[PDB]
Design a protein around this nucleic acid. Structure first.
Length: 49
DNA sequence: GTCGTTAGTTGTGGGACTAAAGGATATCGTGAACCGAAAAATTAGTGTAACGGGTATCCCACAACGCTAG
C-alpha cells in the first residue's frame, strides 16, 4: 500500500522510457517495455475515471 | 584471461476440451465440572337484580261511514 501510494506514474513512465532507450541488453529492454505497458495502462485509466 | 550478451533449449506453470436430457447418494475419533442464563409453569386474588318516570325502537291489529233534519 505504501509503495504503490508513493509511486508517481508519469515519472515512472519517463524513467522506464529512458531505461529502454539507453540499455545494451535486449532482455532488460523487454522487461522495461513490459512494465511500461502496465504503467501506461494505469495512466490511461486515470483519464476516464 | 575475464565479463556481459544472445539465441536456443529445458523445465515448469496456466488455460481450452459440441449440443438435448437428468440430477439419488454419506459423511469416525469424546474430557470433566461448575456457573450462568432465560424460558417455562404454578399459584394467588374478586362476584348482582329490580326499580320510578320517560321515551327510542320493534311486531301486531284496525280504520280511513253514510243518512236525515233544522
Amino acid at each position: 500500500i505504501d509503495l504503490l501510494a508513493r509511486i508517481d506514474l508519469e515519472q515512472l513512465s519517463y524513467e522506464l522510457r529512458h531505461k529502454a532507450n539507453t540499455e545494451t541488453s535486449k532482455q532488460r529492454k523487454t522487461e522495461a517495455l513490459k512494465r511500461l505497458q502496465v504503467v501506461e495502462a494505469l495512466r490511461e485509466s486515470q483519464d476516464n475515471r
